[PDB]
Every structure is written in C-alpha cells, then in structure tokens.
Design a protein around this ligand. Structure first.
Ligand SMILES: *C(=O)c1ccc(N(CC)CC)cc1
Ligand SMILES: *C(=O)c1ccc(N(CC)CC)cc1
Ligand SMILES: *C(=O)c1ccc(N(CC)CC)cc1
Ligand SMILES: *C(=O)c1ccc(N(CC)CC)cc1
Lengths: 484, 477, 484, 477
C-alpha cells in the first residue's frame, strides 16, 4: 500500500500530492503517458504514482511554452526577477515538507534535503539582484555618428534535464537564471524523483498563476528516455541543459550538435583527493570521510579516488577504517542519521558489480564491499586499496560509496596520474610551491580545486567570469547603428 | 612553368618562398606527405609547390607542440603579449609582399590582400593589451578564512583550421588570442592557400627563434581533409577552432563532441532589408559593395536583398546602373574593384546556380555569365523574381549572385528572414525607430551581427577553475 | 496632547514608539541631549518626543561602533548580505505602519510613504546578491612568480546624514551597501523626522540582536547641527555620506576635505523640463504636473524650471493651470489624497518669501502663490511665468511647489541657458538628432536625463559603472606578491 | 652663460629650445609673465629661460581651450585614441634628447630620464586600447518600453598641475587618459622644470597641428603658485588633477571643493617592514634601491625601515656595506646610480633633517653630509636609534634619509605603521602567510600600494549620466 495513504506520511498532502499525480504541467495539468510508481529507498515501499508525459503531451507543452514566451519575453528583466523572488519565498514557506520529500523519495539525509531546497531559495535571492545587471555596453564607433551595441536576448525555450541525486537545486539554478534572462523552461526530471519534480512545479505554478502569467513559462514533462531524447532532438528547444550520466550526456550533446543547437552539459565526477606527506592528517581524514560517504557517495562531487603519500598511506587508511565504523546508519529523515540508502536497487547491483571488478583487477576491500542486512537499498561504505591508478574500474562512473586508494612516492608521478583523467580536485599539503603548481597550468584540469579544505551545499563553487553565468542563457549580437 | 621562377615574381623570395616549399613546421621545417601546386586564379598559372604533412608529420608535430607548451605556459601572459607584439611588427615589415601573395594565390584585390595583413597587425596590437587583462576575481567565500579564487589556465593545444577566403586574418585572430592565453597552436589552412600559410608561418617562426622560444608554439601542418579529420579526432587537441563550410563544420563539431573536446565553429547567408522609408542613397551602394566585395566570397557577403514593393523596381534599376561601373581586372591592377573567383569549381558552381535560378522562375537582370578572359572571372549577378524560400537562394556557395525579393509587410519580411537557420548577419535600412527596436530585440533577427543603416574573447581559449583556499573568542598559539 | 496618546494613532506603538523615545542606539538605547517634539505637518499637532544625543553620547557611540567593526569586518561578505536580507524582511513585515509613520511625521502621501519603505526593501533584496560580487581581479605580473591583486577592504565607519524628504530610503541605500561592504554605520537623520529614524533603527536593532551581533554596527545618534558637524570633523568617520541642502553640504564637504576624509554628497536639485515645439503635449502636461507638485515639490528630483517653446508655451501653461485646479488635497494618509502639506512652518515661510521675490524680479503668479486656508502646512502649488532664465530666485534652493516657466525660440538658446546651471534634466521632443545632442557631450551635465518619459520610486535611476557602486564604500589597494 | 649657448649642449635645439622660450601654448606660443631661468642641479649652471604665463595669458588660454573642446569632444573616442598613439610615436622619436633634458634640468640619472619618457610612450599605447573601452551598459528598466542607458561624457577642461620629480610622466598619464575621454587639458608644471614642460608641449603641439586639430586641446601655462591657484579657483576648470606636496594639495582640494568642482589629488611616507623570518638577501637590496633611487626624491621613496630586533643590527650593517658602493656622479655619466638633489633648498632641508635627527637622539650610521663637489649632492644617509613617532621621521621632505626602527612584536610594528596618516605604500618581507593576509586584509595596512617580498581609470576623467528613454492586449495603429 502507498505511503501517501498512511497516516504518518499525511504531510505529503501539504505539497499537493495524492495517490496518483499529473506529471505534465503547461498551464494545465495532465499526463497520458506511462504511470510510474516511485519508491522510498529506505524501505522499498511505494510512495505514490505519477502519470508521465506521452509524446503528444510533450508536443503540446512545447507549443504552449513557446506561446507563453511571447508574453514572458516582453516582461522587463527586473520584473522577471521579482517573479523569481516570489518563487524563492514560496519555496521558503514549504522548505520543511519539501526537504522531507527529498529525503523520502531520493534518500539523502534530512538536513541535505532541506539544505538542497535552501540552495534553490538562495539562488532565487541572488537572481533578483542579478536581473538588474542583464545587459551589454554601448561603445562609440571609430565612425562618427555610429554606435556599437552589445545586445543580449533570450534564447527562447530552455530545456532542462536533471538527475536523481540533486532533484531540486540543479533545476532551480537553471530555472532561476533562465527565467530572469527572459526564457521559458521545460523540465524533465529523473523518473525516480517524479514526486519531487511535481511538488516543485506545483509551488512554481501557484506563483505564476497568482501573477496571472501563463503557467508554461515553467513547464514540466515527467518522463523517461523518449522524452529526454525528444528534447535533445527538438529544434524548438534553443538550449538544452543536461545534468546526469556521462554516457547519456554524450548522446544528448551529439543530438544537440547535429541540429546546431546549444547545450550545457554537467556530467559524471570521478573526483580525486591527494594527500601529500606533509598534509595535516587532522584535516585529511575527516574531509576524506565526508567527501567519500556523504549522500552515500552519490554526489557529482563525491571523492572516489584518494592518493596518499606512501609514508602516510597506512595511518590514513587505518583512521578512515575506524571512522567508517562509527557512521550512524538509518532512515534519512531521522535527524540522528548520517548515512542513508542508495537511490535504487539497480544502484546496489552496480555497487556489487564494481566491488567484484575491483577485486578481480587486483584490489583489496579493506572495509565494506557488502550489502547491509536491513530493509531498503543500504550498502556498506567501502574502501579499496592495492589498485593501480590505471585500473579500469577506478575510472568507471558508479554513484556508490567506493573509495579507491592509491600510493605515491613523489609529486611527479601523482600529478601525472591525475592529468591522465579528463570535476573536482582536492589537495592537502603545506608546500606552497606545490599548491601553486597544482593550481596553475601544469596542475589539475578540474573546474573545482580545493586546497586544505576541512569539512549546507557549497553552491558558490559551481557558479564565464564572476557573475556572467546569465550570458549562458542568452544570445549576444553586435548591433551597429548609424544615427548620422 | 612556375611564376616563382619568373623574374617579375622574384618578390616572392622575400617571403622565403622557393619552387618547392616545406609545409610542415614544428621547430624544424619538413613535409613527407603529398606535394600540392597552387595556382593564381587570375590566370590559372602555377605559382609554386608545397610538400604537405603526412600522418607521421602530424603525429610528430603534435608531440613537439605539447613539449613546447611546457615552456610556453610558464611565461607570464604580458610577456607572451610582447611576443605577439613582435609578430605584428614582423608582419608589418613584410606587409606589401605578404599582401601581394594573398592577392596572387587567393585572388582578392591588392588593397584587400594588404588590408587583411593589416587586420592581423591590428589584432596583434589588440592582443598585447588584452594580455594584461587575463585574470579572474578573488571572491569572498561564505566561509570565514576561505578565499574563492577564479583561476584561468590555457587549455593547452589549440588546433586551427582556416578557409581560403581569409587565409591570413582568421588564423591571425585565433593565433594571437590563443598565444596570449598561454596555448600552443597547430595550423592547417586551406590547401589552395598553402603558400600563404607557409609564408605567415616563416614570419612567426623567425620571431619565436629570435626570442629563443621553441617554434612548435606556432606549428604548421599543411594538408587536406585527412589532416583536418585527425585534428578533430585528436584528444591532444584541447580546442579546435574551425572556420569554413557548414557541411564540414558540422562533422568537425561532431567529432570533437565525440571525444569531449572543445570546438569553436565559424561556419552565413547574409540578408539586406530595405523598407519603404529607407534612404536609397544608403541602400544602393551598401548593397552593391556588400554583394560584390571579394567577388562575393566573404562569410559576410550579401546574398539576399529584400526590398519593399514600392521601391523594388527603382532600387533594382539603380543597382543595375551601378553594377555596370564595377571595375574588373587582375588583383594587382591599380584601382580595380573586382577580381577572379578562387577556383575553377567556383565558376562551375556559379553557372549551375544561375541555371537553377532561371529554372525556378528567376530573371537574371544583370550579369550571369562567365567573362571571356584568363582566370576564373564571372559577372557579378543580380536575380529577381524568385520566391524567398527557393532552394537555390539558400545554398551555401561562394559566388557573386544577389537574389532580390519583394515584400509588402514588415510582418512577412521578418517572417521570411526568421525561417533561415544560422544566418550570420542582417542589415536593415529604415527610419522607423520602433521597427529597429523590434528587429534588434527578442522578437527580431537571430543573427549575431545586426546593422542598421550602415574583450571577453580570451576566455574562449582558456579553462576556468574555482579554487577554494584556507587563508572564548580569543586566539592563542 | 500627543498624537501617540490618542486612540486612533495607537498603531504607532507597533513600531515600538512611545510618548518619549531614546534617540541614541549603539547596542544600548539612550540620549542625554536635547528633547525634541516632532509634529504632524498635516495639522501641526505634536506626535511624540525624542531624546537626542549629547556630545558625550556621540563620542561613546563612535567608540562602540569602532569596536563592533572589529567583529563585523571579520564576517564574510555573503553572510553580511544575509543580515541585510533579514533587515529587508523585517522592514517588509512592518511596511504598512512604517509607511504610515512616514506620511504622519514627514507628510508625503501614503503610497509614497509605503513606497519609500519598499525602496529600502528592494535595496536589501539587491544587496544580498551584490554581496557575492565584492572583490577584485588577480592578474599575472610581467615578472615571473609575481601576482598583482586588486584588494578591496571596508573603509571602517560610514557616517550617514540624511534629510527630511526621504527619511527612510536614503539611509537605507547607504546602510545596505555599506553593510555588505563590511562597514559599520552611524546615522544622524533630520531632527523633524526623528520618530522615523528611531523606528527604522528599532527594526534593524532587533535583527542585529537576534543574530547576536553588536548593535553598534547600525548606530543611531539623533541630533541637530552640532552632531552633524562633529561627524564631518571626526577622523574616526572614514566616509561621510551626506544628503541635504547645498549650503550645509558644502560646509560638510569642506570639513571632510580639511581632515583628508572621504565624502559622498547628494545636494540640492534645481531640475529642468524642456518641451520643444514638436513635443507630445499629452506627455508633457501630465509629466510636468507630477514632477512639479509630487510630494508637494519636496523631492531632490522635483521639477522647478520648465522651458517651453514659445509656440506652445501658452497652451501648456493653460492646461497645467486647469490641471492644478483638480489636485486632490487633504491628509496625506487619506488614500484619496494626491497633495499633502509642506514639511514645516518654516517651509511655508520660505515658500512665501520665494513667491514675493519672484514677483519683485518681474515674475507673474498665474496660479497659486498663497497659503491654503486650512490646518497644517498647506500651500497652493504655484506657477510663475515671465521671469528670465537668469532670475536669481529661479536658482534658489527652495523645497516648495513653485514652477518657474520660461519661453524659448530655438534649441540654441535653451541648451545654452541650461548649461549655465551646475540633478536631473527631462526633455520632450521627437527630433532624434536633438535628443542625441542633449544626451551627448554638448548637452545637459545632469546625472539623470529623461527623454519623453511619461509619469513607486525610480531608484534604478540613482545607482562608478553598472553595479560598481559598492566600490564607493571600500578602499582599493594594489597588492604585489612575490611567490617566487 | 647659458648651457644652451654652448656647443656641447647644442642637442637641446633638437627639442625646439632656444635661449629664451615661450612658456604659454594655446594654439599659439606666447608668454607675457615673468621670465624664469632654470638651472642644472649637477653643476648649478643656468640652462635656458622660459617666459611664463601672466594672468591674462591664463585667461586667454582657458577661453581658447574651451573653444577647442567644442571640436575635440565631437571626435569619437577611438579616433582620439589614435591622436594619443601619434603622441607616443612623436615622443619615441625624441626619446634620447627628451630623456637627456629630463636628466639635465631635473637631475635624475639618464636611464631614469629616458625611462620616464618611455613610461609616457607606454601610457600612450595603453590609452589607445582604453579608448575603445569607453562606454556604459544599456540596462533593462523595470518599466516596459523604457531603456536605461549609462552614458559617459567628458568633464570638459582638465587642469593638470605636476611636480618636479616626475616632470613628464605624471602629466603624460593625466593627458593621455583625459584626451581619450574627450577632454581638453591645461598644464602647469613645476617652475624648475619649465624647459621640460615646454619641450613636451612642442612635441604634442606638432602632432595636433599635423592632424589639423586646435592646439589648445593640450594647452600649457607655465607659472608658479599664482597660476596654480587660479586653476584651483577657476569654475571653467571642471577637473583639477594635482600632484605634489600635501600642504599645497590640501589647499588646492579645498579651493576646488569651495566651487563644487572635481579634483584628483596625488600627495607619501613609505615604510618597509622586515620581520624576523625575512629573506635578508631580498630585504637589503630592496631597501637600498627604494631608499636612494632618484636620490630619495620619488613619491614612493622608502623613508622608514622597520626591522625585527633579532636581525636589526645585521640588516643595518649589510645596508651600510652596500651604501658604500653606491656610484655617485653627474646624471649623464655612464653607469652612475646616484645624482644631485633637485635644488639648493633641498640640500639645506637635508642638513636640517640630519641635525634634528641627532637632536632627537638618532645616530647617523652612514652619510649625513654634503658632498664636496659642484651641484646639489648629499650623501645617502641612514639613521638609527630614533623613536617611531619622532616628528622628523614623518616630515614630508624629499631627501635620501632612511630612518631605521627596531620592533619586537608584529602587533606593535603594525600599530606604529597604522598611526601614520595617508601613507602611500607599505612593503613587507616575511614568509608567514597568516601575517601577510593580516597585513593585506581589513585590519592591516591602509596604504593604496602594498608589496610583499618584492582599467577603470578613464571614469575619473568623465561624468556619468543615467538616461531613460522610451523605446485588449492587441496593438492597433
Ligand atoms: C553535483 O552533484 C552537483 C552539481 C551542481 C549543482 N548545482 C549547481 C547547478 C546546484 C546547487 C548541484 C550538484
Ligand atoms: C568571414 O569571412 C570572416 C569571419 C571572421 C573573420 N575574422 C575574425 C575571426 C578575421 C577578421 C574574417 C572573415
Ligand atoms: C532625492 O530626493 C533622492 C535622491 C536619492 C534617493 N535614493 C538613492 C540614494 C533613495 C531611493 C532618494 C531621493
Ligand atoms: C610618485 O612620485 C609618482 C606617482 C605617480 C606617477 N605616475 C602615475 C600618475 C607616472 C608613472 C609617477 C610618480
């Protein structure tokens, strides 16, 4: 029986959810596609159902969004910012139950569910101010009576495909900035976080509707691969922002390129921690633990490879091993819990596969490697030593808590090994020259680099230069005017 | 027999050119691939020969470039700017003979050959100033004692593929900006402008060498589709800048995307729109020079002219009278305006296009024929009477054919122009301010360049990183 | 008897006001200086009393503010932005009663009282986003191993002196930006709007105190000229932002310069409207009316000089005259009212003086010129013709609704006349070349220029380039680091 | 008899200098004020003479400048940039003789005289690039159909008052930026560097004239305190840039404030701080060259050196050994490091300062005496043993006297340095990262320039305006 029909989960109704929900929103609510049940990963119990988009729903929604755009694009950017502000406030009002839904359906612990909603609120607060800054310079020409104008216009319809592990804030970032830039949006979320997508969309729909704006400015089309593929191939989707697996992302990028569209791709993270001989172990150990096992190893920023100098390799592993033992496991909505379940049963199987492959490729499981004996999708946070940095499994996209540990003897080889990889790098050392080399041209090619950083989400590290990220959701033109 | 073996073309030797030239430079000169002979399009005579890159030449050049990068990337951006400045100086010193080579091998008129080199000179001066602006903000972290640094680093090796019609300045732009950004470069130009590529590379090579820098910072691998494809597929080429045809460009972009690399693509069917209230003394000369400049072979060349029906006949008549005064001649002839098409195939394509235009109901009101003289000369051509969506008027083909269209409403002309995909520029003539705002604004043209009555580029060649660093109420120690 | 002791004005207590209020806040509330009564300008009735700062209060407050700065400056700018956000929300919660207080004590109509509070809220919303953007570039040196860093630091203590006519939002703009920039503030408001200053400070004090921050980050020292002079002369006040009369402002600027301090001065506005022969009279007439008589002619942006082409001079005057007749007069808190009283009795006397001086200098009063026969400080909105553009009275700082009208025959002379003046210019014409000349180097030297603008406060027109206004509240250093 | 009438100084004529020169330029050359003779500080011989501006000369020059501005302000910023570029070229062509004049009249060594002209050349190149960046954003209005344009306009006439110690480059900076920003300029330099002011103005005047521009765009009125005061009080001078002494600067700023004009003031007592963990191989040469460069007459000259007590004696001893090797000579002597003070009064002030330092308990550990040779030569000087707040060590006086102070704690040395008002720069030597962040951050130095172990400027010359313009659901018409 459905969790939403059970008394203690009645709070789900505060988000407008019921036993069976419409997964399409374009000003009207609907859904003639496949009905999907989403499950609570902490106990494998069905929560509720969502009627996903058919192809016809998708087609209709795109047309309605492009119609809404005609209205929305004529609304001054600061007034668009005000709408985004109101979205932030509406999320604020529901931050506790929406956070609880994130922990329930997705599986991250409560303060991260709530904190992810907070990131969306923060982004809205930011966007209101940003909306006053959207524009380019007028420069004088070398020609008398001629003006040179850098003009920024909305791209039109921004398609947004998001992943299971951040099922609120990635949409939120894309949506807040796309909106202030004068675009309409169409969202296809992970099918296993459909209730979350529906709930967020209900909050946004109310703001739009209260402001007498067409709902399709923020359209939703819940669905699986066919819907995502349709968006990738749709010339009416002027910009496709995709976040998710490397394999699907590659195919999305190719489809967009084939039609000369624009895409923004945020793909898989095989992130490294490097601890040099002179590292502060009091910093290294807790930072590595939270980076590796936080959100059950399912962040795009999750530490999956730990390089340790051979001199301190054993001590650091021994302390991580003891630390892993003390991780508090349970339901993710229990405030005491630090470690919840993996998102799906398939995830647990992928985890088991990876662990076997690591062993066969020479690795030793010095902690974990196994499924926990309890309801839900619980696996032991896992540590593997002995592999070469070259090992195929260590460079396999697996959203599971498996930490591959590598020894190194000097700066030379460990820099080289990491340069062989093509999201974030974190180093621990007191050698300033070493830090400058790693931050400079010869170092990591990662978009995110941390230096001696001890262990809310750090959205500030994922923001073009400075505040110019809005330019990614607009198109530039150079306009030359002869007013002579 | 080769022009470069004739006394009157001895000036070619001032560029270090010989009867047969090495088309590979990576610190050393070489080339073990196929020889290519390039021809002057003004008389179809062979100029000289270039030995192109083999696959092995390519592989070795990439390796040497990546080795040079270890040295180049360590040089502070302003110092790299000074190298680029010296390149501009070296170009300036050879501007007359290099310009003449551009005119001789490619076919554009001398003032434009020289002008294109001058454009590269100006780019170098621009790049020097830019080189002191490369950097990012330190932002405050929300966490006390932590700094957020926005760091910019070179991407590494920048591959540059260029086209025949601007065989100097497009490379120049990519090379100067990529250089100040701390990248090494690898150039593959159009096979039919190989001598120009060699000559430019010789000038740059001398500057590098005189500064005791490794020459592979500005590497050359002359070749055709094989070399270009290798670059597109090569994981060692961190960024591929391609300029050229949409067909080839798409395949390049796809290949780059297949390996998660970065590409810059510059691939346009430019339109001019004259509304009823237009100043025709602006419209007619603008249309003419945009249509026939460089014999219709620019990426910005005007190929479609929309005219309000009330003024359509007059503007066409005025254009015809002005076209008749176009001064045709060899690229080096004083005061000439109009030279040859780049190739014999261009001439065939031109004739094809004219035939198709008549077949689809169009009228040739001016030109349309090959000129009976040596070289690849065709009459600059005007076609009326075609429908706006007629397949021949959207065909990407570098020929001086201007297709003219009537319109009644602002609404319909905007509609017609907004169903062209990936147009490069749109130029409008009108005195209606409201109309201008409509055309420039969100519901208007989608073109990247818009004309009315006529500094962040370095980030394209670098990679950004966000770097976070750690910098009873009483602090003891 | 005091209005605050009368039943219908009990809403004043929602702002924490009582019969006698402390006018000093520095973490503690106090005031050993002169007690002042402020009056309702609509009826001359006393509202309540405020105990202003003594010199000793002032000295103590400055020391406490500089102590608070040691704490405040160590708080990350984005966290400072969050405090400013909360101030915005706290103002929001009290926007109706605070707006009503502005209409009561200051005298502008209710939607402007409320709207002025809204401007402060808007500025706070803006500042939260701005706080993430505070910083300068790191550039590479020509010298290997050397970094060039543009560093921004708070100036320290920012003294803020404001005027009667915008007794909330000018402080608010200065305070919001100064705060995110890591400064502490000290406020001295107009003595005749002391209750407003006290109320705003109570709202801010609560936010600071709830966040366990020292209250002196946002200090208040109510007082008259001696307090303002002390601030001007105080080397501990690193930046003095002054808004008010030209005469006092000049003296403030000189005192600051004498001690090599920094000042920001916003002084008197003798603003012009120019209507050319080809102007849209349907735009000109209502725009001139609201610009001239809005807030009873007491804005820094108030239109005081109207240049009309001789061809349309008479029609435009005749229509303004008819329009003035239909202005709805009454208590400014009455939602129906468009036109309230002048702020003080002295203002009414200044008004009478100006009108007499205009007559003696050759001018004709074609409408108004007189005091209205009713309780409070009501004068007739006034129109004067016949003066030369040269007339001394027409270039006299008088916050009164007097509109001096001038004829001109051509663009030449009217541009010249205006260039003789050294805040805002508004032109009405269809001649594009004319517009470009007036906007360009040869035109107005005003900081604000409007073109055919028809008639909430336009804070966007009072914002250095773009969003760089925060630099005015910080000090720049160029730091050269040798990390080689 | 005048140096310029001697054969060996005939090179002065290459600058258009004569026995007596006009010190007013406003399109025409003139000067009806007092004649001044300037002297070479290396031998106290008269060089040549300049006829300065009378009040009437000043009044007429302002009028002519404001008339020139009507023309100049209409020229597009990039075109104004090109004029500035040509000025840089013209300076470069005379760089050797103009540099020698700087050395001859002002007294800094030749490599620095030439170097200062080179600085002006470099500024001109910088300004050319800046000239294409002058502009503001169009921002969206909150009101539909309305645009917010940020407009920048020239302020009009920029007055420039400069000092003796950098008699070329300070004017150069102000002039080049003010010019590209569309302003006209009026220059009054130090009376004792009048010949330098004339020579620079002759170079600029020729560029303007050859471009058919009115010469008053770059006007000159040579004079003293009377002319400077007139500029400060003159409502027609929209912006007054003053560089010089704090005493005079304050009065200038006050006079400008009295008339609601704009001023830029550049008025410093620079400190060096060596902590216990400092690299002394960095400290000693840095301290020496910063202390004695230009015989101690830069605005950046090191006058206070704080040394941790543990290393104080060693650093002092090392400085003394290095000071003894300073190569003293005439400014034109090859390989020399140290020339004369600018004036005889500077020498008197130096002797005064040395006496006062001993009187207040200081010890002269090196130098302290006049050198017994022609000209205004004094020994570069080191004084130890004084208290940090001793009145003589904070006196603004351009002399090569380095005051040395001991300290024990970071806390006390920071305290001592933070009770100096309006210090220009602070240079620290230390390997402690935490200490650096403390010194660079909000609780650290208040100096505008901070050194560790060693593009928005155009808006200063313009005025900003915010310009708002107007650009059943169905729209009819
Ligand atoms: C990785 O899991 C990841 C990447 C980016 C974000 N954002 C920025 C778009 C939302 C805060 C979240 C998570
Ligand atoms: C079109 O033919 C075209 C495009 C771009 C350029 N550049 C910029 C890369 C060189 C001036 C030239 C020609
Ligand atoms: C004039 O009365 C005036 C000037 C400025 C402001 N501001 C900006 C500081 C507050 C909105 C208000 C009124
Ligand atoms: C100090 O003597 C000093 C200050 C400033 C300058 N400039 C910039 C105006 C010229 C390089 C020189 C010397």
């Amino acid at each position: 029986t459905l969790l939403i029909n059970q008394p203690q989960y009645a709070w789900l109704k505060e988000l407008g959810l019921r036993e069976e929900n419409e997964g399409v929103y374009n000003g009207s609510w609907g859904g003639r596609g496949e009905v999907i049940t989403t499950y609570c990963p902490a106990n494998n119990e069905p929560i509720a159902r969502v009627r996903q988009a058919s192809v016809a729903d998708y087609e209709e929604t795109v047309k309605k969004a492009r119609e809404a755009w005609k209205i929305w694009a004529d609304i001054p950017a600061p007034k668009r910012g005000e709408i985004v502000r109101q979205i932030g406030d509406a999320l604020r009002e529901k931050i506790q139950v929406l956070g609880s839904l994130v922990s329930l359906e997705m599986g991250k612990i409560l303060v991260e569910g709530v904190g992810e909603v907070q990131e969306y609120v923060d982004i809205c607060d930011y966007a209101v101010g940003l909306s006053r800054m959207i524009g380019g310079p007028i420069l004088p020409s070398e020609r008398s009576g001629h003006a040179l104008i850098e003009q920024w216009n909305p791209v039109g319809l921004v398609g947004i495909i998001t992943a299971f592990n951040f099922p609120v804030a990635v949409y939120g970032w894309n949506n807040a900035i796309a909106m202030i830039c004068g675009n309409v949006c169409l969202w296809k979320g992970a099918p296993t976080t459909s209730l979350i997508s529906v709930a967020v969309t209900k909050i946004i729909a109310k703001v739009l509707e209260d402001n007498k704006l067409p709902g399709a400015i923020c359209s939703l089309t819940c669905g699986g691969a066919d819907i995502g593929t349709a968006m990738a191939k749709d010339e009416r989707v002027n910009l496709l922002s995709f976040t998710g697996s490397t394999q699907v992302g590659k195919q999305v990028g190719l489809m967009v390129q084939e039609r000369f569209g624009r895409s923004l791709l945020e793909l898989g993270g095989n992130n490294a921690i490097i601890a040099f001989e002179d590292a502060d172990l009091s910093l290294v150990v807790p930072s590595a633990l939270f980076a590796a096992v936080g959100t059950a190893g399912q962040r795009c920023t999750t530490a999956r490879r730990l390089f340790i100098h051979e001199s301190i390799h054993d001590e650091v592993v021994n302390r991580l091993k003891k630390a892993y033992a003390q991780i508090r496991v349970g339901n993710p909505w229990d405030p005491n819990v630090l470690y919840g379940p993996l998102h799906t049963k398939q995830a647990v199987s992928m985890f088991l596969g990876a662990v076997e492959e690591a062993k066969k490729e020479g690795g030793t499981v010095v902690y974990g490697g196994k499924v926990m004996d309890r309801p839900g999708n619980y696996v032991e946070p896992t540590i593997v030593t002995g592999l070469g940095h070259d090992a195929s499994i260590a460079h396999t996209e697996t959203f599971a808590p498996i930490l591959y540990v590598f020894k190194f003897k000097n700066e030379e080889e460990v820099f080289a090994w990491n340069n062989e990889v093509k999201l974030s790098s974190s180093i621990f050392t007191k050698d300033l020259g070493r830090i400058f080399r790693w931050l400079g041209p010869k170092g990591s090619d990662c978009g995110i680099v941390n230096v001696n950083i001890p262990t809310a989400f750090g959205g500030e590290k994922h923001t073009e230069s400075g505040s110019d990220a809005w330019k990614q959701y607009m198109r530039r033109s150079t306009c030359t005017i002869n007013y002579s």
